[PDB]
Nucleic acid binder design. Structure first.
Ligand SMILES: [Mg+2]
Ligand SMILES: [Mg+2]
Ligand SMILES: [Mg+2]
Ligand SMILES: [Mg+2]
Ligand SMILES: [Mg+2]
Ligand SMILES: [Mg+2]
Ligand SMILES: [Mg+2]
Ligand SMILES: [Mg+2]
Ligand SMILES: [Mg+2]
Ligand SMILES: [Mg+2]
Ligand SMILES: [Mg+2]
Ligand SMILES: [Mg+2]
Ligand SMILES: [Mg+2]
Ligand SMILES: [Mg+2]
Ligand SMILES: [Mg+2]
Ligand SMILES: [Mg+2]
Lengths: 164, 50, 205, 273, 156
RNA sequence: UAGCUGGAGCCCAUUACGAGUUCUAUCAGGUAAAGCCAAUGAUUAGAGGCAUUGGGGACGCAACGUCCUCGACCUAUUCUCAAACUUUAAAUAGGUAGGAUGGCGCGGCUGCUUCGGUGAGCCGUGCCAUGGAAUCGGGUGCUCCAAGUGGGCCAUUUUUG
RNA sequence: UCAACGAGAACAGAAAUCUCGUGUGGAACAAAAGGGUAAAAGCUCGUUUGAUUCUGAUUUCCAGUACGAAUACGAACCGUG
RNA sequence: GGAUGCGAUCAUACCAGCACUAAGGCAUCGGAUCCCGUCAGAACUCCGAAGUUAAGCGUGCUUGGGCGAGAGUAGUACAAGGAUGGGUGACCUCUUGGGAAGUCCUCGUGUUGCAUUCCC
RNA sequence: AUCAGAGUGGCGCAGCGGAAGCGUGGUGGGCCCAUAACCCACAGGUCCCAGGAUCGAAACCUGGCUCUGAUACCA
């Protein structure tokens, strides 16, 4: 249906960086995402203590922060400008979302005002049609109907006719 | 020779020959162990009858 | 080395099957339960005949494999490897024990072998063949019944091979096309399921 | 997409949980009476907020189902004078005041328990003083989070001022200084008199007059400028304490037409292709 | 003690019935117990407070004490050559009202109205159930009669 | 030491109160069976599809492709099973009730309880209650003192090594 | 809300971190095995010490003794909400 | 014929795929000054009505899964009691009674309490 | 027949969950005319086979295998 309630819109960009290390390495991995987001990030501890990766259990090995709103759009357009407004026709996930990964400094911001190196990073955006609170609220939560679950074909049909 | 013995043989026969003694049904069944909050009140109420 | 099988004949103890508790069990003698062409569909072999035990015992794994080989050598030499399907219908799941100075201090024993618990009128072997050649299979079952401890009948089945179908009723369903051949067995079509899942010519009330 | 064994071994939760409207852990602990009182229900002050109403009910439980004895909705306040913004903190205050007055009048002790005639920010305990103890009800928030400043606790203060005896503490009334661990009487006064809305009406009207118009449409066209909340809630308090009182869905098609359609689909498929 | 704990041998005794696991319906909390009423003790697996020992499951007794959250049940235990009136406390989760006496109470009031009515009219009545007795004789109108015979043995 | 037994009795009694029993009513079970075309586990043999690539031949100038292959996998099946598996679930036995120790009315107490004569219980008083299924019968009903015994064996059924 | 599965995202692969979907428990609950638990009895977070005092009562073993353990009230003092 | 709130019974109520809905109500929804909350006004909290029934909620459909009932399985399996009954034995029979369960076939897919409020 | 003990580099053996070594042996240089010897470097292992718990296993528990050492007496 062409109903003016069924529009796609970003729910959130999640900016994660899998460093698998700690110390000043990951503190700078954090402050860089601070510069990008404007909001304080949260450290993602490890599990499974896989040795061949050189990670201990319950050690902070990643740093992510969730950005949503106009700030999310403003940073997502630069993230796509990295990929020159073209993805691989497979980055899109079956449910509602797509992602890709970049290297930091092709974003906006002078590099060593914090003296932090290039950090690669996986943008991951989740698309939604207005009305997912019926799947996210606390009282009377249920599934959202197929007719207003974004899926792949709508993700492409959102990516290519508009916003590029 | 096996020093350990244990049977329920003959046990019902001994039980039932002086009967299965039921204790006498009593008017004014006993109040021992009932809720003392209730028992205090009942004792006061019997105290102040006319 | 093994004991005589008469010592384990009566069913006297509750089943002791291999499990998280019965460990150390040896592997059984029989390791194959279908011999012949186990691949032909229902319609090649309509003739079915059953070697049916008549008394409760523990036909051991060795006994019941000796039966398959004693029926199979005969049946393959005479009717060729082109015209019979053997299936033993019994599985050695019961585990036997043995207790071999010491008296019966700690008399529970380590397992000895494996045997299968049969029933009154429990089919024990079955073979399926074409009616022209059913004599070889029947007499082969007779040549096998001297490999089992108890006494057995050899009964021709009223069913179509290894199917749950009477002969006339199965062939009638084949006529009206209300039956699907799945291979060794068969399926009715019925009044249940969604219309879409059915073949165009295979939808029935 | 779910297997037969899943469907067959599934156990369905209680319907008021498959619909996700009731917390049974809370409900058992609320309605479980001491067994040595033998019938006396624990009446629950159940306050709920929809997106445009404030339901308030004094209800008690019975095997056949809960039985209401007094209902108060915020959408019936237009009867009393409050027409707009009937889902704010003061609106739930007035809903609680209304429900308390209606319960007290129905149980015939309103004259002996009047509470505060005038609303006060300071937390209120009423005296059971003489021969007739106040009606006692238990707050039943529901599924919501019990945070400071909640409209549930606005309704709570409404009922407490209306004269009910409700188990309460002053640790979640609006204006609780979570650092100093005490209320502010003036701040709670402001909140129960709709001041927290009035200051924001001024906040938009100071230098954001477009969002002000697009945000408070009903206030504007009912002509309530920000300084006219105080006496408006005064008079609604007075009014409340003065008068506390065909086929559009398809039928289930029956057996006859069900298999009438079934034979048609069957002939369609088997004849076709 | 002496070889068995309280909840020995209760693999299938204390388990919930199939698909009746989880929430406890509120009627089990609303049913009120008055001293003298007959309650049947059947344990609930989930509520581990106030459980009776595994013997008292599936028995009936008169209440003797009603407290907050707890019922004093009173049932007869046969040990040796005598009966002990064991007086135990169980939570309401584990007991239900007994319907042994529902029909007796109903027949109580039914008998009383009939004896009052008989007192009003000719003052003779017999308020007793007699067990199923001989049936009286009667005629049967001859219908189509189905002849049945023993069947020949089919070895199939 | 409890049990089983004797002796001394005493208490009452055919009104009642009971019963190694049945009937009516109503609870509780997880054994026999049964089940795997239900979960856990064990397990035989094929049919049809399918992989975002489990691996190979051939085309793959090329892949965001396949024809065979052992086969994962999925689907509907299928032969056989379980004391320490179970949805279902017997028979036999188990518990409780079948009135005079009941019910109702009236006015009194409560230091409990309720928003409250609202309950819960009791107390005094007055009324009713054809004996409230069948059958049978005096009772350990109450108490005391105490003997011996505390090595068992056989049988039918269930049953462990 | 778990285990697991499905589709996904630089380095990143069978396995590191993140997102969404399904998820009757296929996880977790110190340990043995059984039972039980899903807006919890599990995971994280706040606050705490009812792991307190006085003596009785009951259940389990039982001779209907003790001990251990548990359960239900009572009279105090408190924790949390 | 509805809806909301609190619910009772907790699958005939669930699960999967779909088509549809008058007023009202629910809901979606706008915003983030305030109380409040988080990495994130997504959640929660507060304030509010511009729009939309797109979703949820509700109704209905499917030779649907599941579930409930019924016939049937079957007087079969089993099992209390009896036999100086049969049998070498395993087992079985008769006598006095009790009597199951899967597969298969047919039907069904909620009932309802209290307070308020909407219809045409 | 029971009960212990030990299975680790090519051989004999050290090892206390973050986790592998000792001598010697082997591989490549160096000294010598050449081989030792000596000097300097290099590479090691299915931690007996199969499971589980455990942040974390070769160690911890258990099942299976092979060797060795004990105890098998009164008649
Ligand atoms: Mg002895
Ligand atoms: Mg809560
Ligand atoms: Mg002891
Ligand atoms: Mg004992
Ligand atoms: Mg002892
Ligand atoms: Mg059970
Ligand atoms: Mg058992
Ligand atoms: Mg003695
Ligand atoms: Mg069985
Ligand atoms: Mg069954
Ligand atoms: Mg199975
Ligand atoms: Mg009975
Ligand atoms: Mg909780
Ligand atoms: Mg004791
Ligand atoms: Mg060299
Ligand atoms: Mg040299």
């Amino acid at each position: 249906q062409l109903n003016p309630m069924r529009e796609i819109k970003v729910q959130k960009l999640v900016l994660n960086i899998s460093v698998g290390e700690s110390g000043d390495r990951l503190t700078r991995a954090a402050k860089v995402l601070e510069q990008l987001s404007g909001q304080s990030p949260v450290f993602s501890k490890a599990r499974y203590t896989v040795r061949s990766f050189g990670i201990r259990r319950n050690e902070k090995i990643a740093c992510y922060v969730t950005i949503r709103g106009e700030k999310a759009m403003q940073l997502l357009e630069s993230g796509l400008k990295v990929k020159e407004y073209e993805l691989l026709r497979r980055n899109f996930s079956d449910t509602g979302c797509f992602g890709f990964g970049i290297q930091e400094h092709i974003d906006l911001g002078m590099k060593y005002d914090p003296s932090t190196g290039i950090y690669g990073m996986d943008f991951f955006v989740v698309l939604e049609r207005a009305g997912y609170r019926v799947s996210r609220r606390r009282r009377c939560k249920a599934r959202v109907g197929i007719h207003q679950r974004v899926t792949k074909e709508d993700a492409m049909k959102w990516f290519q006719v508009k916003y590029e | 020779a096996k020093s350990k013995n244990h049977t329920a043989h003959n046990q019902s026969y001994k039980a039932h020959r002086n009967g299965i003694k039921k204790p006498k049904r009593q008017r004014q069944a006993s109040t021992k162990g009932m809720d003392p909050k209730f028992l205090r009140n009942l004792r006061y109420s019997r105290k102040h009858n006319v | 080395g093994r004991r005589p099988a008469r010592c384990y004949r009566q069913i006297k103890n509750k089943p002791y099957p291999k499990s998280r508790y019965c460990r150390g069990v040896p592997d059984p003698k029989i390791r194959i339960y279908d011999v012949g062409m186990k691949k032909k569909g229902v319609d090649e072999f309509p003739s079915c005949v059953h070697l049916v035990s008549w008394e409760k015992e523990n036909v051991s794994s060795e006994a019941l494999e000796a039966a398959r080989i004693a029926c199979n050598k005969y049946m393959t030499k005479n009717a060729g490897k082109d015209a019979f399907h053997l299936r033993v219908r019994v599985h050695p799941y019961h585990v036997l024990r043995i207790n071999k100075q010491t008296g019966m201090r700690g008399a529970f024993g380590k397992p000895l072998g494996t045997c299968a618990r049969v029933d009154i009128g429990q089919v024990l072997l079955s073979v399926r063949c074409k009616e022209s050649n059913a004599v070889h299979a029947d007499e082969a079952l007779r040549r096998a019944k001297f490999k089992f401890p108890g006494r057995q009948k050899i009964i021709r089945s009223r069913k179509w091979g290894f199917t749950k179908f009477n002969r006339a009723d199965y062939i009638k369903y084949k006529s009206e096309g209300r039956i699907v051949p799945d291979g060794v067995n068969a399926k009715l079509l019925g009044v249940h399921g969604p219309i879409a899942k059915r073949a165009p010519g295979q939808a029935i009330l | 997409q779910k297997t037969r064994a899943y469907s067959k071994r599934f156990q369905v939760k209680f319907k008021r949980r498959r619909q996700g409207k009731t917390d049974y852990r809370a409900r058992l602990r609320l309605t479980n009476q001491d067994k040595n009182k033998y019938n006396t229900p624990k009446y629950r002050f159940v306050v709920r907020f929809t997106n445009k109403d404030v339901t308030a009910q004094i209800v008690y439980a019975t095997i056949a189902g809960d039985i209401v004895m007094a209902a108060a909705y915020s959408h019936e306040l237009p009867r009393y004078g409050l027409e707009v913004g009937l889902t704010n903190y003061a609106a739930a205050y007035c809903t609680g005041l209304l429900l308390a007055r209606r319960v007290l009048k129905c149980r015939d002790l309103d004259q002996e328990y009047e509470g505060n005639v005038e609303a006060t920010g300071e937390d209120f305990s009423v005296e059971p003083a003489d021969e007739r103890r106040p009606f006692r009800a238990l707050l039943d928030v529901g599924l919501i989070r019990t945070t400071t400043g909640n409209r549930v606790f606005g309704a709570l203060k409404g009922a407490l001022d209306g004269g009910l005896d409700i188990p309460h503490s002053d640790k979640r009334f609006a204006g609780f200084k979570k650092d100093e661990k005490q209320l502010d009487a003036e701040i709670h006064r402001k909140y129960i008199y709709g001041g927290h809305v009035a200051d924001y009406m001024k906040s938009l009207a100071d230098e954001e007059p477009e969002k002000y118009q697009s945000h408070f449409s009903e206030y504007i066209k009912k002509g309530i400028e920000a300084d006219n909340m105080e006496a408006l809630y005064k008079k609604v308090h007075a009014a409340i304490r003065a008068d506390p009182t065909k086929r559009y869905n398809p039928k289930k098609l029956t057996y006859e037409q069900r298999k009438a359609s079934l034979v048609e689909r069957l002939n369609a498929l088997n004849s076709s292709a | 003690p002496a070889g068995h704990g309280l909840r020995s041998r209760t693999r299938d005794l204390f388990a919930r019935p199939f698909r009746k696991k989880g929430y406890i319906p509120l009627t089990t909390y609303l049913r009120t117990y008055k001293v003298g009423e007959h309650v049947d003790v059947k344990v609930n697996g989930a509520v581990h407070k106030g459980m009776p020992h595994k013997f008292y499951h599936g028995r009936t007794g008169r209440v003797w004490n009603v407290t907050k959250r707890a019922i004093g049940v009173e049932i007869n235990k046969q040990v040796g050559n005598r009966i002990i009136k064991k007086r135990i406390h169980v939570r309401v989760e584990h007991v239900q009202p007994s319907r042994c006496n529902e029909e007796f109470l109903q027949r109580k009031l039914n008998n009383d109205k009939l004896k009052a009515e008989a007192k009003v009219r000719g003052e003779v009545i017999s308020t007793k159930r007699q067990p199923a007795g001989p049936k009286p004789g009667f005629m049967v109108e001859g219908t189509t009669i189905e002849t049945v015979t023993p069947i020949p043995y089919d070895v199939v």
